[PDB]
Write a protein that holds these residues in place. Structure first.
Motif, short mmCIF file in Angstrom:
data_model
loop_
_atom_site.label_atom_id
_atom_site.label_comp_id
_atom_site.label_asym_id
_atom_site.label_seq_id
_atom_site.Cartn_x
_atom_site.Cartn_y
_atom_site.Cartn_z
N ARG A 103 0.81 -1.22 0.00
CA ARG A 103 0.00 0.00 0.00
C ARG A 103 0.85 1.28 0.00
NH1 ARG A 103 -2.22 3.21 3.81
NH2 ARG A 103 -1.60 1.80 5.51
N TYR A 148 -6.44 5.97 1.20
CA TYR A 148 -6.78 4.63 1.68
C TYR A 148 -8.23 4.57 2.18
CZ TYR A 148 -6.81 0.77 5.12
OH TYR A 148 -7.13 -0.34 5.86
N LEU A 186 -7.17 1.80 -2.70
CA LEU A 186 -6.73 3.19 -2.75
C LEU A 186 -7.63 3.93 -3.74
CD1 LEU A 186 -2.86 2.73 -3.01
CD2 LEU A 186 -4.05 3.70 -1.04
#
Ligand SMILES: O=C(CO)[C@H](O)[C@H](O)COP(=O)(O)O
Ligand SMILES: O=C(CO)[C@H](O)[C@H](O)COP(=O)(O)O
Ligand SMILES: [Cl-]
Ligand SMILES: [Cl-]
Lengths: 220, 217
Positions: A142, A158, A171
């Motif tokens: 991420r 996020y 995302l």
């Protein structure tokens, strides 16, 4: 305003259902617009031999109406896939993934002979981008991917408290210039840790059914 | 014999741990000998990131705290094995199923050192079947797309990856252009990661020869 939009969604979904003419393997999308399709499917029960679902949400809804849902590996090839979209431009290229099912939705589109997209007018645009682009990523990647998206000029946010059906996170990317959906979809697919991105352009919609503000049907 | 060469390669790679760094740790038997060697570099290793729960378990058993990549940020040095390595330091990886997180670690690493014994050195990648991690729902679809390319996909039964996915091991691929095929496989819908490490290859490859010498490619 929300009751008005719901009416247009139902019109689009109902119209799409008419394309269920023969005995087929039907693929079912995800979202509120699709929710009105699922309800309409009771009136086409004898035509629907096999159902494949792009989400556990839709699977739950289908099973509640007595429909048996079959895994894509045993179903094989989908004849017709019907799904919503968050945005649709002038060349039937979509942004999808607002309801998190974008991976399996893209797989269903890939395995479908024909893909029909059902929208109301609010989702029609000239240029994709204003709606933030969902991207499904491997949790471990991420932070790395967020950085790569910052390099491209995007602003990744996020989506908290969301774990996809596949165990991944999303995302949502703001500020992207997506004047070339084909090019950017290809680009994002090369970023390590990205499972799927929300641009549906390399394999676009074959037909887009759009309900207008005046409750008419536009077939794009 | 092979275990001895693996230990030599791993021990040699460990010498590159010179300063206080964020170390990234790979997966496999060759890496297993690195993990054991890491006790002798404990003061240099500030933060450890692991490419697999297998390695995480091994690291934690030796008293090493393992930190998630999201909180670690950027890896200074990543050390990992490989199933094959050609002449341009391009690898096939994923024989031990950790290929997704291994590729993510390589992507977030300033430097990637690959540790192998000679049996893994080749001129052309392909003989070892190419692992591909796929979304379970897309397995049959992807298998068909791989058949079109001339590959022969075999589902690795009883294997579920750390990420909840399944593996297809693909035989008979002509991989004379690793860069091109890695790009191509990334475009197939439902593929999470493929086992070709070429777009971002190894920076250094440490290879232990049959005569117990070190070759730095
Ligand atoms: O892609 C989708 C789910 O990920 C949906 O098709 C879309 O994002 C939402 O549809 P609606 O706006 O009709 O609820
Ligand atoms: O890619 C890997 C795990 O997915 C390993 O690095 C690769 O399989 C080599 O393992 P070994 O050193 O045990 O032969
Ligand atoms: Cl983030
Ligand atoms: Cl096919």
């Amino acid at each position: 305003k929300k009751n008005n939009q719901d009416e247009l969604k139902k019109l689009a979904a109902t119209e799409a259902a008419k394309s269920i003419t023969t005995e087929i393997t039907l693929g079912v999308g995800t979202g509120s617009t699709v929710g009105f399709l699922i309800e309409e499917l009771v009136n086409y029960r004898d035509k629907i031999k096999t159902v494949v679902s792009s989400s556990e949400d839709s699977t739950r809804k289908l099973k509640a109406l007595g429909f048996d849902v079959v895994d894509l590996n045993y179903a094989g090839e989908i004849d017709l896939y019907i799904d919503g979209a968050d945005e649709c431009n002038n060349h039937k290229e979509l942004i999808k993934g607002g309801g998190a099912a974008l991976t399996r939705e893209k797989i269903c589109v890939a395995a479908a002979k024909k893909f029909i997209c059902i929208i109301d007018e609010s989702k029609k645009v000239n240029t994709l981008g204003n709606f933030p682009l969902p991207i499904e990523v491997i949790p471990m990647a991420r932070s790395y991917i967020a950085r790569q998206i910052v390099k491209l000029g995007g602003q990744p946010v996020y989506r908290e408290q969301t774990i996809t059906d596949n165990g991944n996170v999303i995302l949502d990317v703001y500020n992207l210039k997506i004047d070339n959906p084909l090019k950017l979809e290809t680009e994002l697919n090369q970023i390590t840790g990205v499972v799927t991105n929300g641009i549906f352009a390399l394999k676009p919609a074959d037909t887009v059914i759009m309900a207008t503000k005046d409750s008419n049907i536009v077939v794009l």
